[PDB]
Design a protein around this motif. Structure first.
Motif, PDB file in Angstrom:
ATOM      1  N   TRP A  63      12.822  -0.726 -53.033  1.00  0.00           N
ATOM      2  CA  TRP A  63      13.066   0.717 -53.139  1.00  0.00           C
ATOM      3  C   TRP A  63      14.396   1.006 -53.888  1.00  0.00           C
ATOM      4  N   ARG A  64      15.067   2.106 -53.603  1.00  0.00           N
ATOM      5  CA  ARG A  64      16.297   2.342 -54.327  1.00  0.00           C
ATOM      6  C   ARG A  64      17.383   1.296 -53.986  1.00  0.00           C
ATOM      7  N   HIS A  65      17.423   0.831 -52.739  1.00  0.00           N
ATOM      8  CA  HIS A  65      18.462  -0.116 -52.324  1.00  0.00           C
ATOM      9  C   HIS A  65      17.940  -1.502 -51.996  1.00  0.00           C
TER      10      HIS A  65
ATOM     11  N   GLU B  66      16.198   3.864 -45.190  1.00  0.00           N
ATOM     12  CA  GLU B  66      16.833   3.327 -46.401  1.00  0.00           C
ATOM     13  C   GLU B  66      17.294   4.488 -47.259  1.00  0.00           C
ATOM     14  N   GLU B  67      16.362   5.389 -47.517  1.00  0.00           N
ATOM     15  CA  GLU B  67      16.589   6.436 -48.474  1.00  0.00           C
ATOM     16  C   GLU B  67      17.468   7.566 -47.944  1.00  0.00           C
ATOM     17  N   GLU B  68      17.377   7.824 -46.652  1.00  0.00           N
ATOM     18  CA  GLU B  68      17.801   9.126 -46.156  1.00  0.00           C
ATOM     19  C   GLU B  68      18.912   9.053 -45.151  1.00  0.00           C
ATOM     20  N   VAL B  69      19.119   7.893 -44.534  1.00  0.00           N
ATOM     21  CA  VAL B  69      20.172   7.817 -43.539  1.00  0.00           C
ATOM     22  C   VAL B  69      21.280   6.833 -43.844  1.00  0.00           C
TER      23      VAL B  69
ATOM     24  N   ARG C  31      27.909  16.270 -44.676  1.00  0.00           N
ATOM     25  CA  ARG C  31      27.474  16.543 -46.037  1.00  0.00           C
ATOM     26  C   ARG C  31      25.999  16.154 -46.214  1.00  0.00           C
ATOM     27  N   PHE C  32      25.697  14.868 -46.065  1.00  0.00           N
ATOM     28  CA  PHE C  32      24.308  14.422 -45.956  1.00  0.00           C
ATOM     29  C   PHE C  32      24.017  13.919 -44.556  1.00  0.00           C
ATOM     30  N   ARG C  33      25.013  13.317 -43.908  1.00  0.00           N
ATOM     31  CA  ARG C  33      24.902  12.922 -42.497  1.00  0.00           C
ATOM     32  C   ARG C  33      26.245  13.089 -41.802  1.00  0.00           C
TER      33      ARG C  33
ATOM     34  N   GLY D 237      28.082  21.800 -53.124  1.00  0.00           N
ATOM     35  CA  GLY D 237      28.917  21.090 -52.169  1.00  0.00           C
ATOM     36  C   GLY D 237      30.390  21.084 -52.517  1.00  0.00           C
ATOM     37  N   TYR D 238      31.195  20.569 -51.578  1.00  0.00           N
ATOM     38  CA  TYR D 238      32.647  20.353 -51.724  1.00  0.00           C
ATOM     39  C   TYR D 238      33.480  21.623 -51.961  1.00  0.00           C
ATOM     40  N   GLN D 239      32.918  22.771 -51.581  1.00  0.00           N
ATOM     41  CA  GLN D 239      33.569  24.077 -51.709  1.00  0.00           C
ATOM     42  C   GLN D 239      33.477  24.860 -50.393  1.00  0.00           C
TER      43      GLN D 239
ATOM     44  N   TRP E 168      15.348  16.640 -63.060  1.00  0.00           N
ATOM     45  CA  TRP E 168      14.691  15.507 -62.446  1.00  0.00           C
ATOM     46  C   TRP E 168      14.809  15.745 -60.939  1.00  0.00           C
ATOM     47  N   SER E 169      13.836  15.309 -60.142  1.00  0.00           N
ATOM     48  CA  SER E 169      13.935  15.366 -58.677  1.00  0.00           C
ATOM     49  C   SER E 169      13.980  16.771 -58.093  1.00  0.00           C
ATOM     50  N   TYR E 170      14.984  17.013 -57.248  1.00  0.00           N
ATOM     51  CA  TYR E 170      15.270  18.357 -56.756  1.00  0.00           C
ATOM     52  C   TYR E 170      15.476  19.279 -57.938  1.00  0.00           C
ATOM     53  N   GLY E 171      16.145  18.777 -58.964  1.00  0.00           N
ATOM     54  CA  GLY E 171      16.312  19.505 -60.217  1.00  0.00           C
ATOM     55  C   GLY E 171      14.977  19.833 -60.859  1.00  0.00           C
TER      56      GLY E 171
ATOM     57  N   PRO F  83       9.212  16.180 -59.962  1.00  0.00           N
ATOM     58  CA  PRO F  83       9.669  17.240 -59.075  1.00  0.00           C
ATOM     59  C   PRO F  83       9.002  17.209 -57.713  1.00  0.00           C
ATOM     60  N   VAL F  84       9.744  17.626 -56.701  1.00  0.00           N
ATOM     61  CA  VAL F  84       9.139  18.140 -55.485  1.00  0.00           C
ATOM     62  C   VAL F  84       8.337  19.386 -55.884  1.00  0.00           C
ATOM     63  N   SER F  85       7.206  19.639 -55.222  1.00  0.00           N
ATOM     64  CA  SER F  85       6.428  20.859 -55.488  1.00  0.00           C
ATOM     65  C   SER F  85       6.203  21.702 -54.234  1.00  0.00           C
TER      66      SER F  85
ATOM     67  N   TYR G 268       5.285  17.828 -48.527  1.00  0.00           N
ATOM     68  CA  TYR G 268       4.997  16.549 -49.192  1.00  0.00           C
ATOM     69  C   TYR G 268       6.174  15.597 -49.145  1.00  0.00           C
ATOM     70  N   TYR G 269       7.353  16.122 -48.842  1.00  0.00           N
ATOM     71  CA  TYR G 269       8.545  15.286 -48.841  1.00  0.00           C
ATOM     72  C   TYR G 269       8.914  14.770 -47.438  1.00  0.00           C
ATOM     73  N   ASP G 270       9.813  13.789 -47.361  1.00  0.00           N
ATOM     74  CA  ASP G 270      10.017  13.062 -46.108  1.00  0.00           C
ATOM     75  C   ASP G 270      10.711  13.893 -45.037  1.00  0.00           C
TER      76      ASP G 270
ATOM     77  N   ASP H 294       7.186   6.020 -55.071  1.00  0.00           N
ATOM     78  CA  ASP H 294       7.253   5.927 -53.613  1.00  0.00           C
ATOM     79  C   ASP H 294       8.039   7.067 -52.945  1.00  0.00           C
ATOM     80  N   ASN H 295       8.827   7.794 -53.726  1.00  0.00           N
ATOM     81  CA  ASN H 295       9.818   8.733 -53.184  1.00  0.00           C
ATOM     82  C   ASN H 295       9.311  10.203 -53.246  1.00  0.00           C
ATOM     83  N   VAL H 296       9.255  10.779 -54.440  1.00  0.00           N
ATOM     84  CA  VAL H 296       8.552  12.025 -54.645  1.00  0.00           C
ATOM     85  C   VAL H 296       7.192  11.624 -55.190  1.00  0.00           C
ATOM     86  N   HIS H 297       6.185  11.579 -54.331  1.00  0.00           N
ATOM     87  CA  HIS H 297       4.900  10.977 -54.683  1.00  0.00           C
ATOM     88  C   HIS H 297       4.231  11.704 -55.814  1.00  0.00           C
TER      89      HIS H 297
END
Ligand code: KIQ
Lengths: 726, 726
Positions: A86-88, A166-169, A318-320, A546-548, A591-594, A617-619, A623-625, A671-674
């Motif tokens: 996967w990514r990692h 792996e991906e999210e935490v 921020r993310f966790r 973020g960061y503001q 790309w992605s969320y973008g 893209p997510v649609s 459909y997302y995790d 495997d991520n955004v199917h």
């Protein structure tokens, strides 16, 4: 005169940035690999010896992917047969070269297809995960000890994460943590038994007659999540006349009531470990602090050392939830938490007291805590100049919070407004890594008075090559919308002129905690579009950024696909009025969320955008995790937030696509955004009679990153943009 | 001035062809299925009465998909809840209506999800298949007897075909044959226990969270085939307390030495049934002729009565060996076989006589036997004017082969050179269906003296509509390639002028036995391309072409993707020499086999073509099914034809695509030519750095035939072709 930054320059990497990647082995020395061999550098004087020769493994007979020297300096771990997952995650083969007897170890070696390997932090113990189980080598040449026997492919994971964790935490494959002197090995166990499976075809090499179905345990929004358990094993204790005993640390009760995650593990001392747990409703996290009990061999987490971290305007962290940094004795700690004003700052905790004391404050945020000595805490923030997209190293005096010193702000303010750091073992030295707005620059420093010892790499070689070429320039600024300020950057073509009317590409991400307006020096696609094609490439950080501060970051809480897409539209509207934009040639890509945002924008019927590109893209959020989506969205139940889940889909806006040119791109083995997500987009456009352009990438994942697919995609996207504008 | 035939016209069906679909119910009457109600027609005088009013089932409470009347005239079967499976297969719900009592029958109904239903040929017996088992109802209201107990979803099929038999041998879901007086039911059983499964994703409604993986037993070239069994049951001897006994007919000897198929069953008399078997190497077939034995209750197939049909140059049959038409006494029969000249003609056999006597000959072919009386054989052929792309109805006096009368040639030679036919039950009457070159014409005739009773439909409404629109013309003609004549047709824009230069689009199929040059009148995409865009659309019948003898059709034996692709290139080449083609604007497109050929042409490196479109192409033969593929290729083994399996892939030609603009389209739910096939093409193109256009159609199959997808694909192809020619 002369030439531009071309597509082929970007794809063939003709202008490479030089790096100075080092690895601290002591308080005083570091390693510095190359294209050839491994040197050991003395940090004080800068003299070097050869740690080991480039030629040593000529007759190894395998392409070596990475090295890992035991903290000992006595062994080298050789990674090869690298196969990406996967990514990692990945698997690889491993051999151990013994630097005392200068021979490869041939007995009892780490098996092939190994999932993860880690040295203990001090001597030369080893832990690896193979087939979802944990093994420990006390010496590199001796038979390993089975710590775990319950590992099963796609079901039970010991010492490694499943897809979602792996991906999210953890943003890693690794789910094990040695104690500081290596006595204990802590590890997590994930159970995917009940988790539903995403299934997609993988076509493989041409010679494969039947496509294979990849099936991965992947919980979409509101589905059954994996469960988790935590264990600590003593690695000194292990005889092997029986099962060395893992001691479970459970709970806590406020978490056991329903669905929960393990979100952080951080050793505090040899005998004190911290764990943060987080509710499925990512509103509430609890940190436990657990002591080894010599009088039972158990671990006790005294409620009392329990710390509760929560948010009333959004999700935690921020993310966790952030990670603690413990003072040496382990009786107190520091973590970045949210202010009363919503700004993230460092808070100081006693382990058995519930109230922390903020040690920094103001309308800026601490990015990360970097090191801790008896006298100082070192951190990264965007304080300097009030620009949320810059990074600098500061220290603060533990004695007196009033005394804070910037360590990087002034070193070279016109070239260097974005820093990261890498401290030696006891923070006796640090390496600064400046990454823009000018060319990356690496420097060594000693902590005793923050003296700059020398330049490690100044990128002069690249500097020279770049002035034979007409480079673009980067403008970092802001705009004001109902009171607040919101930053943007723009990659301007050479010889810019505010009188002319350039075509503009809105490059978007706009995810929660995103930042696309910063001071980093990049050589990318946007660089080509500006340099050769004279397109302005812009990015805007709006609500949800973020960061503001949380006021800005939590504005999209429970409400994805609202303000952040709006602000991207408004941004464009604001950009064209600036007088140098052709308001007939405005495009947008993500790309992605973008990808999602771009799609949502191109589907809003605002008329501001002529064309656009969505890549993986997510649609729709269902459909997302579970972990990512629910963090921001809650549960897709009629009781919780189902209505907004159903209102924030791309396909519901199919009709408005009649008014734009659209290119939709997706790897088939994503495997991520199917691929499902783009499959549903296309179907809705078809069903409503909208022409559009499409491109699948067979056997490519979310990265679309193989050498040939990367080239092909940017080629294809360039053709589309040029055509949309020319 | 005045309009052209537009893309909207083609897509919205503004210019509709009326048909005249009738369903015979006796030697004297047919039913005329109106949108309103069903009329019964007298074929002699042309008078009619209402058979049942449109409002008979006004409150049935369900949409009625199809009707079917017992040979009796006492019962109507009603089909509702229609759910499509493959090209022929489907499930439906069935109700039976009493015609006399004008009443629905409510007891012992046929179940929902019934797979196949058929009346017996004389009375009102029903045989149906439900959950892969056969059941028989002697009377509409009496309990069914269960013939079969072995049925198992995806594994054992009794009385219905599996995927490959449905598509490739029987061209139907049905695998059961009533004897002429309904006494016996014969049926096949297919076993797919070992057949590997093709797997693909089905996305479904937006609301489906996780894609389902559809899986279907499908043997690709050289894989384990379904095995088959044949049984006959006496339907007059079933006991409702005891199990029905099926009597197996096995073998034959020459088939059992290896893998084989059953490729035809045709009853000869009330007690004689005929069976043709085909070896997996489709070189060799055998007809068994099997007799019921009263004493033992078995069936005996006398070696002595078995007829061999083999080929030294190719496979047997056009697609499969032809069906026999037995004489009254079942002691002789007529079937089409290949000459000594390699031309397909009608041979007269005696059942115990090994050699047959050809009753037709010449450089043309009999397309099909349409009816056999004691007196005459009526067949369709392409003799007239030596035109392989034309069709006429003939009769040949069985007592004198000298007396062959063409029944259609002369009726209207201007308007009508392409005929099909529908005979009443004993051939007392027949409908003639003229389908070009003029507008379709439907007429009724009486056989007794071949009198032209009356016009049934002449499309005059369409005719009036088409004079206010600039319609293209059609040329049908031939070129000469070393000795042999090869036919092409061109769809020519209105006001065509041979001195001008037009872009050309080669429309290709070019499969084994294909015919793309004919006299059929069509209103399609080509009509629009010529009418509105001024594009010549050409099609060419080269080597491998059907209906011209085996010398041409067998030219590609064991050698698919060679001569048929070469000749398509030769053809375009020759159309440019003709003076009215711009050779900077030659394109090629094809669906299915036509997709493979298009792709193979574009990758030939010939430079003739600027661009082309491949829709659902085969890309390599190992990907396609066993029955179709092996018929032409043999087995993909070193011992047989593996080298050419490997040499005739599309992806081995990817490099040559640098020279063309290419468009690749495929439906994701294609059960027939798997998405895999295009997935491998694009992968090869990406690996070699070739830009190209792609389009997937989510949940669409080989037909890409759903209303919205159809409109979208042709819109998309149109833009592409317009861009290529601009
Ligand atoms: N799956 C998400 C993982 C993720 C994360 O947790 N990150 C990375 C980014 N990240 C992190 N920590 N700090 C930082 C950075 F500093 F970069 F801001 C952790 C961020 C976004 C990822 C994502 C979201 C999405 F909507 C997609 F469609 C695809 C996708 F991969």
């Amino acid at each position: 005169s002369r030439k531009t930054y071309t597509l082929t320059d970007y794809l063939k990497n003709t202008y490479r940035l030089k790096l100075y990647s080092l690895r601290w082995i002591s308080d005083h020395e570091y390693l510095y690999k190359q294209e050839n061999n491994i040197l050991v550098f003395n940090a004080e004087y800068g003299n070097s010896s050869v740690f080991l020769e480039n030629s040593t493994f000529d007759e190894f007979g395998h392409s070596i992917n990475d090295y890992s020297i035991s903290p000992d300096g006595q062994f080298i771990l050789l990674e090869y047969n690298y196969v990406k997952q996967w990514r990692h995650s990945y698997t690889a083969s491993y051999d151990i070269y013994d630097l005392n007897k200068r021979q490869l170890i041939t007995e009892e070696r780490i098996p092939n297809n190994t999932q993860w390997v880690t040295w203990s932090p001090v001597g030369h113990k080893l832990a690896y995960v193979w087939n979802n189980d944990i093994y420990v080598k006390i010496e590199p040449n001796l038979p390993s000890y089975r710590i775990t026997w319950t590992g099963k492919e796609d079901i039970i994971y010991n010492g490694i994460t499943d897809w979602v964790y792996e991906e999210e935490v953890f943003s890693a494959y690794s789910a094990l943590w040695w104690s500081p002197n290596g006595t204990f090995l802590a590890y997590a166990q994930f159970n995917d038994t009940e988790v539903p499976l995403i299934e997609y075809s993988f076509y493989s090499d041409e010679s494969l007659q039947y496509p294979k179905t990849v099936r991965v345990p992947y919980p979409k929004a509101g589905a059954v999540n994996p469960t988790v358990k935590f264990f600590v094993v003593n690695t000194d204790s292990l005889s092997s006349v029986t099962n060395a005993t893992s001691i479970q640390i459970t709970a806590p009760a406020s978490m056991l009531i329903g669905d929960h995650y393990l979100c952080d593990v951080t050793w505090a001392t040899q005998e004190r470990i911290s764990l943060q747990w987080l509710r499925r409703i990512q509103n509430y996290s609890v940190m436990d602090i657990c002591d080894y009990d010599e009088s039972s061999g158990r671990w006790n987490c005294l409620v009392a050392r329990q710390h509760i971290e929560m948010s009333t305007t959004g999700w935690v962290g921020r993310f966790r939830p952030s990670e603690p940094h413990f003072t040496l004795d382990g009786n107190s700690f520091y973590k970045i938490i949210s202010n009363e004003e919503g700004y993230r700052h460092i808070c100081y905790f006693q382990i058995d007291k519930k109230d922390c004391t903020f040690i920094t404050k103001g309308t800026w945020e601490v990015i990360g805590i970097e090191a801790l000595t008896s006298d100082y805490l070192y951190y990264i923030s965007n304080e300097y100049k009030g620009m949320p997209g810059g990074r600098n190293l500061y220290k603060i005096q533990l004695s007196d919070y009033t005394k804070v010193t910037c360590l990087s702000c002034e070193l070279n303010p016109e070239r260097c407004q974005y820093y990261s750091v890498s401290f030696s073992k006891e923070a006796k030295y640090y390496q600064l890594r400046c990454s823009g707005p000018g060319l990356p620059l690496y420097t060594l420093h000693s902590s005793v008075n923050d003296k700059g010892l020398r330049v490690l790499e100044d990128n002069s070689a690249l500097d020279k090559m770049l002035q034979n070429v007409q480079m673009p320039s980067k403008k970092l600024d802001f705009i004001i919308l109902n009171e607040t300020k919101f930053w943007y950057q723009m990659i301007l073509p050479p010889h810019f002129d505010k009188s002319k009317k350039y075509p503009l590409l809105l490059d978007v991400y706009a995810g929660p905690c995103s930042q696309k307006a910063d001071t980093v020096f990049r050589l990318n696609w946007a660089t080509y579009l500006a340099s050769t094609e004279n397109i302005i490439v812009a990015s805007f950080d709006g609500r949800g950024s973020g960061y503001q501060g949380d006021k800005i970051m939590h504005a999209i809480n429970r409400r994805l696909g609202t303000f952040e897409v709006e602000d991207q539209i408004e941004a464009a509207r604001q950009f064209s009025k600036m007088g140098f934009v052709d308001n007939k040639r405005i495009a947008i890509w993500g790309w992605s969320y973008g990808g999602y945002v771009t799609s949502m924008v191109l589907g809003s019927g605002s008329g501001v955008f002529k064309c656009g590109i969505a890549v993986a893209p997510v649609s729709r959020w269902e459909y997302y995790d579970s972990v990512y989506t629910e963090r921001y969205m809650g549960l897709p139940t009629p009781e919780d937030n189902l209505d907004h889940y159903r209102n924030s889909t791309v396909m519901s806006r199919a009709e408005n696509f009649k008014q734009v040119e659209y290119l939709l791109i997706h790897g088939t083995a994503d495997d991520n955004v199917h691929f499902q997500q783009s499959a549903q987009i296309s179907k809705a456009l078809v069903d409503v009679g909208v022409d559009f352009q499409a491109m699948w990438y067979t056997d490519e994942d979310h990265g679309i990153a193989s050498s040939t697919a990367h080239q092909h995609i940017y080629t294809h996207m360039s053709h589309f943009i040029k055509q949309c504008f020319s």
